Amino acid sequence: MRVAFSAARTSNLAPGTLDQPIVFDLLLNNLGETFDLQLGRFNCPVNGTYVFIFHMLKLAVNVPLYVNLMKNEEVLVSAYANAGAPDHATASNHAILQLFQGDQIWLRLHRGAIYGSSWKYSTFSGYLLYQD
Amino acid sequence: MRVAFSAARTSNLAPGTLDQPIVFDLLLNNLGETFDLQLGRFNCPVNGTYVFIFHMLKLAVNVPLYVNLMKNEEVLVSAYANAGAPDHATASNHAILQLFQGDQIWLRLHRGAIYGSSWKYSTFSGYLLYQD
Amino acid sequence: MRVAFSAARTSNLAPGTLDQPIVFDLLLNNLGETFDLQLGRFNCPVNGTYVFIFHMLKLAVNVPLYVNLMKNEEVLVSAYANAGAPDHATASNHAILQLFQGDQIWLRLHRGAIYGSSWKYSTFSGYLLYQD
C-alpha cells in the first residue's frame, strides 16, 4: 500500500546491441521492495495509479541516446539526447498511469550508451500515487 | 478527490504565430476526467496542492524552443531547448502549487515547434497531491 | 504531515568559487513552511519518504554546469548541462528517499552559473509522499 523506488547507475552501460534493458546497480530507495536491481524491473504489487520519472546521462561520444519507458513489452514514453559532439546530454521523461498487480515497468536503452558514476547522474524512480 | 492526468503529442506542432496553446492528442491517464485534450487544459476540480511536469521535444530545426507552464493567463515556470543545429532538444520543467476549483493549467508554446510521434517524447502530466 | 515546496531563481547565480549553495529568491509554494529561501534549504519536519526534483538553466556562456542534490553534506544525485556554445542548457534530476526530522536537503552549484529571471526557468521542488 506504500511503494517508492529510486535507482541509479554508478557504472557505464554500453550494450552490444540495440534495445537492451537498463539494469541498475544502486538503490536510493526501495520502499515496498518492488524494484529488482539486477533486472532493472519494477514489479507492480497492487493495482493503482503510479508515477515514473527518469534521467539518463549519455556517454560523451558523438552517438545519440534513445531511451524508452516500458510497460511489459510496450513503449509508453520515450526520450532523446544528443550533444552533436563528444559531450554528455540528458534523456529524461515521465509518465503517470494505471497499473495492475504483476505489470512490469522498466527502462530500455534503444540506442546509445549511458554514463554511470558515484555522482549518480543517471536515475530512475517510481511510486504509488493512488491505490486502486 | 483523486486526480491524475498524463498527455502526449503524437503529431508535430508548428503554430503559425507565437504564444499558442499546446494541444494534446493522446491521454496515457485521465483519472478524475480533468484534462481536456482538445484545449490542452487541466480543469481544477477541487481546491488543493497539485504537481505538474512536462517534457517537450523540439523539432530538429535550428530554431529554439520556449515553453511556459500557464495558470490561467499567468506564466508560472518556463523551459528552453536549443541544439544549435538541426537536431532535437528537450524543454522540461515542473511546479507544485495551490490551486482553486476552476483554475486552468496548460502549456504554452511561446516560440518554436514541438515533435510528436507514437513514441511519445513530448508529454505533460499533473496530479492532486493534497486535497484542500 | 503535509509538506510541499517549490522555489525559483529570478536572478543569475554566478558564485566566485566552486561548490556553493543555490539560494532561491521566490517560492511558488511552501506548504508546511519547511523551505528556507535565504539558505536554499529544505528542513525536514517529520520522518518520511520525500520526492525532490530540480531544473537548472545554465547561463549562456561556454562553461559547463554541474549541480548536486545534497542531503546534509552528501551528494545524492547530480546533473550536467553544456551547450558546447554560448547558449543555455538545462541540468535536471530527481530523487525519492527516506529522511529523518532535521535532515537538510539543498542544491549545490558545483561548477558553472545559473540563469534567473521572472520567467522562472530554474526551479527546485520537493514534497512529503509518505509520512513515517
Side-chain angles (χ1 to χ4, degrees), chain A residues 2-6 28-29 31 53-55 57 83 87-90 118-129, chain C residues 49 51 53-55 66 68 75-80 82 84 92-98 108 110 127 129-132:
Chain A
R2 286 183 168 187
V3 173
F5 70 88
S6 196
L28 288 88
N29 194 84
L31 180 67
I53 184 166
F54 64 93
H55 289 84
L57 192 78
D87 199 355
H88 306 288
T90 305
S118 69
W119 262 21
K120 299 184 229 63
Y121 296 93
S122 293
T123 57
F124 176 31
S125 304
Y127 58 95
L128 174 59
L129 175 59
Chain C
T49 306
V51 177
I53 184 166
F54 64 93
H55 289 84
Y66 288 84
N68 312 112
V75 173
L76 293 172
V77 299
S78 306
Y80 175 83
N82 198 46
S92 178
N93 211 332
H94 67 88
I96 308 184
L97 68 165
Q98 307 296 129
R108 184 173 75 165
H110 167 68
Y127 58 95
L129 175 59
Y130 302 128
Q131 184 163 354
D132 278 10

CSV table of all heavy atoms in Angstrom, one decimal, chain A residues 1-6 28-29 31 53-55 57 83 87-90 118-129, chain C residues 49 51 53-55 66 68 75-80 82 84 92-98 108 110 127 129-132, unseen atoms left out:
chain,number,residue,atom,x,y,z
A,1,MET,N,0.8,-1.2,0.0
A,1,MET,CA,0.0,0.0,0.0
A,1,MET,C,0.9,1.3,0.0
A,1,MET,O,0.4,2.4,-0.2
A,1,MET,CB,-1.0,0.0,1.2
A,2,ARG,N,2.2,1.1,0.2
A,2,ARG,CA,3.1,2.2,0.1
A,2,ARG,C,4.3,1.7,-0.7
A,2,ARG,O,5.0,0.8,-0.3
A,2,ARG,CB,3.6,2.7,1.4
A,2,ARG,CG,2.5,3.6,2.1
A,2,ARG,CD,3.1,4.1,3.4
A,2,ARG,NE,2.2,5.2,4.0
A,2,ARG,CZ,2.5,5.9,5.1
A,2,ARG,NH1,3.7,5.7,5.7
A,2,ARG,NH2,1.7,6.8,5.5
A,3,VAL,N,4.6,2.4,-1.8
A,3,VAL,CA,5.6,1.9,-2.8
A,3,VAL,C,6.4,3.1,-3.4
A,3,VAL,O,5.8,4.0,-3.9
A,3,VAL,CB,4.9,1.2,-4.0
A,3,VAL,CG1,5.9,0.9,-5.0
A,3,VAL,CG2,4.2,-0.1,-3.5
A,4,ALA,N,7.7,3.0,-3.3
A,4,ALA,CA,8.5,4.0,-3.9
A,4,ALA,C,9.9,3.5,-4.0
A,4,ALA,O,10.6,3.1,-3.1
A,4,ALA,CB,8.5,5.3,-3.0
A,5,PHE,N,10.4,3.6,-5.3
A,5,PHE,CA,11.8,3.2,-5.5
A,5,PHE,C,12.6,4.3,-6.2
A,5,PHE,O,11.9,5.2,-6.9
A,5,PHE,CB,11.9,1.9,-6.4
A,5,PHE,CG,11.4,2.1,-7.8
A,5,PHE,CD1,12.3,2.5,-8.8
A,5,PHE,CD2,10.1,1.9,-8.2
A,5,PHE,CE1,11.9,2.7,-10.1
A,5,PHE,CE2,9.7,2.0,-9.5
A,5,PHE,CZ,10.6,2.4,-10.4
A,6,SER,N,13.9,4.3,-6.1
A,6,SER,CA,14.7,5.3,-6.7
A,6,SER,C,16.0,4.5,-7.0
A,6,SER,O,16.6,4.1,-6.0
A,6,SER,CB,14.9,6.5,-5.8
A,6,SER,OG,15.5,7.6,-6.5
A,28,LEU,N,18.6,4.1,-4.1
A,28,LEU,CA,18.5,5.2,-3.1
A,28,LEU,C,17.3,5.0,-2.3
A,28,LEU,O,17.2,5.5,-1.1
A,28,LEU,CB,18.4,6.6,-3.8
A,28,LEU,CG,19.6,7.2,-4.5
A,28,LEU,CD1,19.7,6.7,-5.9
A,28,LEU,CD2,19.6,8.7,-4.4
A,29,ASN,N,16.3,4.2,-2.8
A,29,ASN,CA,15.1,3.9,-2.1
A,29,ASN,C,14.4,2.7,-2.7
A,29,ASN,O,14.5,2.5,-3.9
A,29,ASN,CB,14.1,5.1,-2.1
A,29,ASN,CG,13.0,5.0,-1.1
A,29,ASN,OD1,13.1,5.3,0.1
A,29,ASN,ND2,11.8,4.5,-1.6
A,31,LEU,N,11.2,1.4,-1.0
A,31,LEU,CA,10.1,1.2,-0.1
A,31,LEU,C,9.0,0.3,-0.7
A,31,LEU,O,8.5,0.6,-1.8
A,31,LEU,CB,9.4,2.5,0.2
A,31,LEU,CG,8.2,2.5,1.2
A,31,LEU,CD1,8.7,2.1,2.6
A,31,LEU,CD2,7.5,3.8,1.3
A,53,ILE,N,9.6,8.5,-13.4
A,53,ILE,CA,10.4,9.5,-14.0
A,53,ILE,C,11.9,9.0,-14.1
A,53,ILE,O,12.3,8.2,-13.4
A,53,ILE,CB,10.4,10.8,-13.1
A,53,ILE,CG1,11.2,11.9,-13.8
A,53,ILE,CG2,11.0,10.5,-11.7
A,53,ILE,CD1,11.0,13.2,-13.1
A,54,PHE,N,12.6,9.4,-15.2
A,54,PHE,CA,13.9,9.0,-15.3
A,54,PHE,C,14.8,10.2,-15.9
A,54,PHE,O,14.2,11.0,-16.6
A,54,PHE,CB,14.1,7.8,-16.2
A,54,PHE,CG,13.6,8.0,-17.7
A,54,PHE,CD1,14.5,8.4,-18.7
A,54,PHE,CD2,12.3,7.8,-18.0
A,54,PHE,CE1,14.1,8.6,-20.0
A,54,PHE,CE2,11.9,7.9,-19.3
A,54,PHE,CZ,12.8,8.3,-20.3
A,55,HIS,N,16.0,10.1,-15.6
A,55,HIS,CA,17.1,11.0,-16.2
A,55,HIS,C,18.3,10.1,-16.6
A,55,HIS,O,18.9,9.5,-15.7
A,55,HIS,CB,17.5,12.1,-15.2
A,55,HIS,CG,16.5,13.1,-14.9
A,55,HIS,ND1,15.4,13.0,-14.0
A,55,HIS,CD2,16.3,14.4,-15.4
A,55,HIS,CE1,14.7,14.1,-13.9
A,55,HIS,NE2,15.3,15.0,-14.7
A,57,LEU,N,22.0,10.2,-18.3
A,57,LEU,CA,23.1,10.9,-18.9
A,57,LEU,C,23.8,10.0,-19.9
A,57,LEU,O,24.2,8.9,-19.6
A,57,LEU,CB,24.0,11.4,-17.9
A,57,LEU,CG,25.1,12.4,-18.4
A,57,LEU,CD1,24.4,13.8,-18.4
A,57,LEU,CD2,26.3,12.5,-17.4
A,83,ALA,N,24.4,15.6,-28.1
A,83,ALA,CA,25.1,16.8,-27.9
A,83,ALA,C,25.7,17.4,-29.3
A,83,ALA,O,26.0,18.6,-29.3
A,83,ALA,CB,26.3,16.6,-26.9
A,87,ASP,N,30.2,14.9,-26.0
A,87,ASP,CA,29.8,15.5,-24.8
A,87,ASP,C,28.6,14.8,-24.3
A,87,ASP,O,27.9,14.1,-25.0
A,87,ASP,CB,29.5,17.0,-25.1
A,87,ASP,CG,29.5,17.9,-23.8
A,87,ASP,OD1,29.7,17.3,-22.7
A,87,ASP,OD2,29.3,19.1,-24.0
A,88,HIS,N,28.3,15.0,-23.0
A,88,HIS,CA,27.1,14.4,-22.4
A,88,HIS,C,25.9,15.2,-22.8
A,88,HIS,O,26.0,16.3,-23.2
A,88,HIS,CB,27.2,14.4,-20.9
A,88,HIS,CG,28.5,13.7,-20.3
A,88,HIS,ND1,28.7,12.3,-20.3
A,88,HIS,CD2,29.5,14.2,-19.6
A,88,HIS,CE1,29.8,12.0,-19.7
A,88,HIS,NE2,30.3,13.2,-19.3
A,89,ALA,N,24.8,14.5,-22.6
A,89,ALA,CA,23.5,15.2,-22.7
A,89,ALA,C,22.5,14.3,-22.0
A,89,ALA,O,22.8,13.1,-21.7
A,89,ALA,CB,23.0,15.4,-24.2
A,90,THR,N,21.3,14.7,-21.7
A,90,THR,CA,20.4,14.0,-20.8
A,90,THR,C,19.1,13.7,-21.4
A,90,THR,O,18.4,14.5,-22.0
A,90,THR,CB,20.2,14.8,-19.5
A,90,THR,OG1,21.5,15.1,-18.9
A,90,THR,CG2,19.4,14.0,-18.5
A,118,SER,N,29.6,7.4,-9.3
A,118,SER,CA,29.1,7.6,-7.9
A,118,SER,C,28.4,8.9,-7.7
A,118,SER,O,27.7,9.1,-6.7
A,118,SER,CB,30.3,7.5,-7.0
A,118,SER,OG,31.1,8.7,-7.1
A,119,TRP,N,28.5,9.8,-8.7
A,119,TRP,CA,27.7,11.1,-8.6
A,119,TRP,C,26.3,10.9,-9.0
A,119,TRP,O,25.5,11.9,-8.9
A,119,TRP,CB,28.4,12.2,-9.2
A,119,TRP,CG,29.2,13.1,-8.2
A,119,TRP,CD1,29.6,12.7,-7.0
A,119,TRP,CD2,29.6,14.4,-8.4
A,119,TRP,NE1,30.3,13.7,-6.4
A,119,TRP,CE2,30.3,14.8,-7.2
A,119,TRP,CE3,29.5,15.4,-9.4
A,119,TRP,CZ2,30.8,16.1,-7.0
A,119,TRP,CZ3,30.0,16.7,-9.2
A,119,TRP,CH2,30.7,17.0,-8.0
A,120,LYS,N,25.9,9.8,-9.6
A,120,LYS,CA,24.5,9.4,-9.8
A,120,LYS,C,23.8,10.4,-10.7
A,120,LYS,O,22.8,11.0,-10.3
A,120,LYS,CB,23.8,9.1,-8.5
A,120,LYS,CG,24.4,8.0,-7.7
A,120,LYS,CD,23.6,7.7,-6.5
A,120,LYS,CE,24.5,7.7,-5.3
A,120,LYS,NZ,25.2,9.0,-5.0
A,121,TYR,N,24.3,10.5,-11.9
A,121,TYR,CA,23.6,11.3,-12.9
A,121,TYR,C,22.4,10.6,-13.5
A,121,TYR,O,21.4,11.3,-13.9
A,121,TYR,CB,24.6,11.7,-14.1
A,121,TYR,CG,25.8,12.5,-13.7
A,121,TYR,CD1,27.0,11.9,-13.3
A,121,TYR,CD2,25.7,13.9,-13.7
A,121,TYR,CE1,28.1,12.7,-13.0
A,121,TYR,CE2,26.8,14.7,-13.4
A,121,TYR,CZ,28.0,14.1,-13.0
A,121,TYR,OH,29.1,14.9,-12.7
A,122,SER,N,22.5,9.3,-13.6
A,122,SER,CA,21.5,8.5,-14.3
A,122,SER,C,20.6,7.8,-13.4
A,122,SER,O,21.1,6.8,-12.7
A,122,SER,CB,22.3,7.6,-15.3
A,122,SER,OG,23.0,8.3,-16.3
A,123,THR,N,19.4,8.2,-13.3
A,123,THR,CA,18.4,7.8,-12.3
A,123,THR,C,17.1,7.4,-12.8
A,123,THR,O,16.7,7.8,-13.9
A,123,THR,CB,18.1,9.0,-11.3
A,123,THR,OG1,17.7,10.1,-12.1
A,123,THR,CG2,19.4,9.3,-10.6
A,124,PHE,N,16.3,6.6,-12.1
A,124,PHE,CA,15.0,6.1,-12.5
A,124,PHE,C,14.2,5.8,-11.2
A,124,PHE,O,14.7,5.1,-10.3
A,124,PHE,CB,15.2,4.7,-13.2
A,124,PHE,CG,14.0,4.0,-13.6
A,124,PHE,CD1,12.8,4.7,-13.9
A,124,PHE,CD2,14.0,2.6,-13.7
A,124,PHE,CE1,11.6,4.0,-14.3
A,124,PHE,CE2,12.8,1.9,-14.1
A,124,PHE,CZ,11.7,2.6,-14.4
A,125,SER,N,13.1,6.5,-11.1
A,125,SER,CA,12.3,6.3,-9.9
A,125,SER,C,10.8,6.1,-10.2
A,125,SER,O,10.3,6.5,-11.3
A,125,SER,CB,12.4,7.6,-9.0
A,125,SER,OG,13.8,7.8,-8.7
A,126,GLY,N,10.1,5.6,-9.2
A,126,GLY,CA,8.6,5.5,-9.4
A,126,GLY,C,8.0,5.3,-8.1
A,126,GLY,O,8.6,5.0,-7.1
A,127,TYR,N,6.7,5.6,-8.0
A,127,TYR,CA,5.9,5.5,-6.8
A,127,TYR,C,4.5,5.3,-6.9
A,127,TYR,O,3.9,5.6,-8.0
A,127,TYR,CB,6.2,6.6,-5.8
A,127,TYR,CG,5.9,8.0,-6.3
A,127,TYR,CD1,4.7,8.6,-6.1
A,127,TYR,CD2,6.8,8.7,-7.1
A,127,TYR,CE1,4.4,9.9,-6.5
A,127,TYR,CE2,6.5,10.0,-7.6
A,127,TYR,CZ,5.3,10.6,-7.3
A,127,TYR,OH,5.1,11.8,-7.8
A,128,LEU,N,3.8,4.7,-5.9
A,128,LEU,CA,2.4,4.6,-5.9
A,128,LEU,C,1.7,5.9,-5.4
A,128,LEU,O,1.9,6.3,-4.3
A,128,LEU,CB,2.0,3.4,-4.9
A,128,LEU,CG,0.5,3.3,-4.7
A,128,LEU,CD1,-0.2,2.9,-6.0
A,128,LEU,CD2,0.3,2.1,-3.7
A,129,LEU,N,0.9,6.5,-6.3
A,129,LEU,CA,0.2,7.7,-6.0
A,129,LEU,C,-1.1,7.4,-5.4
A,129,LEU,O,-1.4,7.9,-4.3
A,129,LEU,CB,0.0,8.5,-7.3
A,129,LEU,CG,-0.8,9.8,-7.1
A,129,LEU,CD1,-0.2,10.7,-6.1
A,129,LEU,CD2,-1.0,10.5,-8.5
C,49,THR,N,9.0,9.5,3.6
C,49,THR,CA,9.5,9.4,2.2
C,49,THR,C,9.2,10.7,1.5
C,49,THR,O,8.1,11.1,1.5
C,49,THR,CB,8.8,8.3,1.5
C,49,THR,OG1,8.8,7.1,2.2
C,49,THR,CG2,9.4,8.0,0.1
C,51,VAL,N,10.0,13.3,-2.1
C,51,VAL,CA,10.4,13.4,-3.5
C,51,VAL,C,11.0,14.7,-3.8
C,51,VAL,O,10.5,15.7,-3.3
C,51,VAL,CB,9.1,13.2,-4.4
C,51,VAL,CG1,9.5,13.4,-5.9
C,51,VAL,CG2,8.4,11.9,-4.1
C,53,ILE,N,12.9,17.3,-7.0
C,53,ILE,CA,13.2,17.4,-8.4
C,53,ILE,C,13.7,18.8,-8.7
C,53,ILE,O,13.3,19.8,-8.0
C,53,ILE,CB,11.9,17.2,-9.3
C,53,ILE,CG1,12.2,17.3,-10.8
C,53,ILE,CG2,10.8,18.2,-8.9
C,53,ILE,CD1,11.2,16.7,-11.6
C,54,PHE,N,14.6,19.0,-9.6
C,54,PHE,CA,15.1,20.3,-10.0
C,54,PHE,C,15.4,20.4,-11.4
C,54,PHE,O,15.6,19.4,-12.1
C,54,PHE,CB,16.4,20.7,-9.2
C,54,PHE,CG,17.6,19.8,-9.5
C,54,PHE,CD1,18.5,20.1,-10.5
C,54,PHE,CD2,17.8,18.6,-8.8
C,54,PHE,CE1,19.6,19.3,-10.8
C,54,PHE,CE2,18.9,17.8,-9.1
C,54,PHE,CZ,19.8,18.2,-10.0
C,55,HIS,N,15.3,21.7,-11.9
C,55,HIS,CA,15.6,22.0,-13.3
C,55,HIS,C,16.4,23.3,-13.2
C,55,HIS,O,15.9,24.4,-12.7
C,55,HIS,CB,14.4,22.3,-14.1
C,55,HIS,CG,13.6,21.1,-14.5
C,55,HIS,ND1,12.7,20.5,-13.7
C,55,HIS,CD2,13.6,20.3,-15.6
C,55,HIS,CE1,12.1,19.5,-14.3
C,55,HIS,NE2,12.7,19.3,-15.5
C,66,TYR,N,27.4,21.9,-13.5
C,66,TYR,CA,27.3,20.7,-12.7
C,66,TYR,C,26.5,21.1,-11.4
C,66,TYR,O,26.9,22.0,-10.7
C,66,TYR,CB,28.6,20.2,-12.2
C,66,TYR,CG,29.5,19.5,-13.3
C,66,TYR,CD1,30.3,20.3,-14.2
C,66,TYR,CD2,29.5,18.1,-13.5
C,66,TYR,CE1,31.0,19.7,-15.2
C,66,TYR,CE2,30.2,17.5,-14.5
C,66,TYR,CZ,31.0,18.3,-15.3
C,66,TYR,OH,31.8,17.7,-16.3
C,68,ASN,N,24.5,19.4,-7.8
C,68,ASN,CA,24.3,18.2,-7.0
C,68,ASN,C,23.1,18.5,-6.1
C,68,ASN,O,22.9,19.5,-5.5
C,68,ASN,CB,25.5,17.9,-6.1
C,68,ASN,CG,26.8,17.9,-6.8
C,68,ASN,OD1,27.6,18.8,-6.6
C,68,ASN,ND2,27.0,16.9,-7.6
C,75,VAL,N,26.5,14.1,-1.5
C,75,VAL,CA,25.9,14.2,-2.8
C,75,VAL,C,25.0,13.0,-3.0
C,75,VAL,O,25.4,11.8,-2.9
C,75,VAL,CB,27.0,14.1,-3.9
C,75,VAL,CG1,26.3,13.9,-5.3
C,75,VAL,CG2,27.9,15.3,-3.9
C,76,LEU,N,23.7,13.3,-3.3
C,76,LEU,CA,22.7,12.2,-3.6
C,76,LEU,C,22.6,11.9,-5.0
C,76,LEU,O,22.8,10.7,-5.4
C,76,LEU,CB,21.3,12.7,-3.1
C,76,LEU,CG,21.0,12.9,-1.6
C,76,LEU,CD1,19.7,13.6,-1.4
C,76,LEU,CD2,21.1,11.6,-0.9
C,77,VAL,N,22.3,12.9,-5.9
C,77,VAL,CA,22.3,12.7,-7.3
C,77,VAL,C,22.8,14.0,-8.0
C,77,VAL,O,22.9,15.0,-7.3
C,77,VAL,CB,20.9,12.4,-7.9
C,77,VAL,CG1,20.3,11.1,-7.3
C,77,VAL,CG2,19.9,13.6,-7.6
C,78,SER,N,23.2,13.9,-9.2
C,78,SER,CA,23.8,15.0,-9.9
C,78,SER,C,23.3,15.3,-11.3
C,78,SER,O,22.6,14.4,-11.8
C,78,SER,CB,25.4,14.8,-9.9
C,78,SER,OG,25.9,14.5,-8.6
C,79,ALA,N,23.5,16.4,-11.8
C,79,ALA,CA,23.1,16.8,-13.2
C,79,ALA,C,24.2,17.6,-13.9
C,79,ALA,O,25.0,18.3,-13.2
C,79,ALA,CB,21.8,17.5,-13.2
C,80,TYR,N,24.2,17.5,-15.2
C,80,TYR,CA,25.2,18.1,-16.1
C,80,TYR,C,24.4,18.8,-17.2
C,80,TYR,O,23.4,18.3,-17.7
C,80,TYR,CB,26.1,17.0,-16.7
C,80,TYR,CG,27.1,17.6,-17.7
C,80,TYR,CD1,28.3,18.1,-17.3
C,80,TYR,CD2,26.8,17.4,-19.1
C,80,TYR,CE1,29.2,18.6,-18.3
C,80,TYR,CE2,27.7,17.9,-20.0
C,80,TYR,CZ,28.9,18.5,-19.6
C,80,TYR,OH,29.8,18.9,-20.6
C,82,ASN,N,25.5,21.3,-20.8
C,82,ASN,CA,26.5,22.0,-21.5
C,82,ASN,C,26.0,22.2,-22.9
C,82,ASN,O,25.5,21.2,-23.5
C,82,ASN,CB,27.9,21.3,-21.5
C,82,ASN,CG,29.0,22.1,-21.9
C,82,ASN,OD1,29.2,23.3,-21.4
C,82,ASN,ND2,29.9,21.6,-22.8
C,84,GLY,N,28.0,23.5,-25.5
C,84,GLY,CA,29.1,23.5,-26.4
C,84,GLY,C,29.3,24.8,-27.1
C,84,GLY,O,30.0,24.9,-28.2
C,92,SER,N,19.0,18.8,-14.8
C,92,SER,CA,17.9,18.4,-14.1
C,92,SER,C,18.1,17.0,-13.5
C,92,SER,O,18.8,16.1,-14.1
C,92,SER,CB,16.6,18.3,-15.0
C,92,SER,OG,15.5,17.9,-14.4
C,93,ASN,N,17.5,16.7,-12.3
C,93,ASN,CA,17.5,15.3,-11.8
C,93,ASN,C,16.4,15.3,-10.8
C,93,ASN,O,15.7,16.3,-10.5
C,93,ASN,CB,18.8,14.8,-11.3
C,93,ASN,CG,19.0,13.3,-11.5
C,93,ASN,OD1,18.1,12.6,-11.5
C,93,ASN,ND2,20.3,12.9,-11.6
C,94,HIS,N,16.2,14.1,-10.2
C,94,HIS,CA,15.2,13.9,-9.2
C,94,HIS,C,15.7,12.8,-8.2
C,94,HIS,O,16.6,12.1,-8.5
C,94,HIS,CB,13.9,13.3,-9.9
C,94,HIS,CG,14.2,12.0,-10.4
C,94,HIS,ND1,14.0,10.8,-9.7
C,94,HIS,CD2,14.7,11.6,-11.6
C,94,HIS,CE1,14.3,9.8,-10.4
C,94,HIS,NE2,14.7,10.2,-11.6
C,95,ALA,N,15.0,12.7,-7.1
C,95,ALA,CA,15.3,11.6,-6.2
C,95,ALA,C,14.1,11.3,-5.3
C,95,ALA,O,13.3,12.2,-5.0
C,95,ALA,CB,16.5,11.9,-5.4
C,96,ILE,N,14.0,10.1,-4.8
C,96,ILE,CA,13.0,9.7,-3.8
C,96,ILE,C,13.7,9.1,-2.7
C,96,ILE,O,14.5,8.2,-2.9
C,96,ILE,CB,11.9,8.8,-4.3
C,96,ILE,CG1,11.3,9.3,-5.6
C,96,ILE,CG2,10.8,8.6,-3.2
C,96,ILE,CD1,10.1,8.5,-6.1
C,97,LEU,N,13.5,9.5,-1.4
C,97,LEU,CA,14.3,8.9,-0.3
C,97,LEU,C,13.6,9.1,1.0
C,97,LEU,O,12.8,9.9,1.2
C,97,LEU,CB,15.7,9.5,-0.3
C,97,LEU,CG,16.0,10.9,0.1
C,97,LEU,CD1,17.5,11.1,0.4
C,97,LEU,CD2,15.6,11.9,-1.0
C,98,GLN,N,14.1,8.2,1.9
C,98,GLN,CA,13.6,8.3,3.3
C,98,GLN,C,14.5,9.3,4.0
C,98,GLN,O,15.7,9.3,3.9
C,98,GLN,CB,13.8,7.0,4.0
C,98,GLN,CG,13.1,5.8,3.3
C,98,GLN,CD,11.6,5.9,3.2
C,98,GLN,OE1,11.0,5.8,2.1
C,98,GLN,NE2,11.0,6.2,4.4
C,108,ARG,N,23.4,22.2,-4.7
C,108,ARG,CA,24.8,22.7,-4.8
C,108,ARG,C,25.2,23.0,-6.2
C,108,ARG,O,25.1,22.1,-7.1
C,108,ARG,CB,25.8,21.7,-4.2
C,108,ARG,CG,27.2,22.3,-4.1
C,108,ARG,CD,28.1,21.3,-3.3
C,108,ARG,NE,28.5,20.2,-4.1
C,108,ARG,CZ,29.5,19.3,-3.8
C,108,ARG,NH1,30.2,19.6,-2.7
C,108,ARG,NH2,29.7,18.3,-4.6
C,110,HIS,N,28.0,23.0,-8.2
C,110,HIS,CA,29.4,22.5,-8.1
C,110,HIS,C,30.3,23.4,-8.9
C,110,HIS,O,31.3,23.8,-8.5
C,110,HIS,CB,29.5,21.1,-8.6
C,110,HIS,CG,30.9,20.7,-8.8
C,110,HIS,ND1,31.8,20.6,-7.7
C,110,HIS,CD2,31.7,20.4,-9.9
C,110,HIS,CE1,33.0,20.3,-8.2
C,110,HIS,NE2,32.9,20.2,-9.5
C,127,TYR,N,8.4,17.3,-1.9
C,127,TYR,CA,7.2,17.1,-1.1
C,127,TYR,C,7.3,15.8,-0.3
C,127,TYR,O,8.0,14.9,-0.6
C,127,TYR,CB,6.0,17.2,-2.0
C,127,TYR,CG,6.0,16.2,-3.2
C,127,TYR,CD1,5.3,15.0,-3.0
C,127,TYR,CD2,6.6,16.5,-4.4
C,127,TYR,CE1,5.3,14.1,-4.1
C,127,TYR,CE2,6.5,15.6,-5.4
C,127,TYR,CZ,5.9,14.4,-5.3
C,127,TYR,OH,5.9,13.6,-6.4
C,129,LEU,N,5.8,12.4,0.5
C,129,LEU,CA,5.0,11.4,-0.2
C,129,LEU,C,4.3,10.5,0.9
C,129,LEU,O,3.1,10.4,0.8
C,129,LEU,CB,5.8,10.5,-1.1
C,129,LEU,CG,5.1,9.4,-1.8
C,129,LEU,CD1,3.9,9.8,-2.6
C,129,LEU,CD2,6.1,8.6,-2.6
C,130,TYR,N,5.1,9.9,1.7
C,130,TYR,CA,4.5,9.1,2.8
C,130,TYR,C,5.1,9.5,4.2
C,130,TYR,O,6.4,9.5,4.3
C,130,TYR,CB,4.9,7.6,2.6
C,130,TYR,CG,4.4,7.0,1.3
C,130,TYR,CD1,5.4,6.3,0.5
C,130,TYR,CD2,3.1,7.0,0.9
C,130,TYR,CE1,5.0,5.7,-0.7
C,130,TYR,CE2,2.7,6.4,-0.3
C,130,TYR,CZ,3.7,5.8,-1.1
C,130,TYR,OH,3.3,5.2,-2.2
C,131,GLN,N,4.3,9.8,5.1
C,131,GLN,CA,4.8,10.1,6.5
C,131,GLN,C,5.1,8.8,7.2
C,131,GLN,O,4.4,7.9,7.1
C,131,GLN,CB,3.8,10.9,7.3
C,131,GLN,CG,4.2,11.3,8.7
C,131,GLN,CD,3.4,12.4,9.3
C,131,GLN,OE1,2.5,12.9,8.6
C,131,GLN,NE2,3.7,12.7,10.5
C,132,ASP,N,6.3,8.8,7.8
C,132,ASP,CA,7.0,7.7,8.5
C,132,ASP,C,8.4,7.4,8.1
C,132,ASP,O,8.7,6.9,7.0
C,132,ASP,CB,6.1,6.4,8.5
C,132,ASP,CG,5.1,6.4,9.5
C,132,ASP,OD1,4.9,7.5,10.1
C,132,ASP,OD2,4.4,5.4,9.8
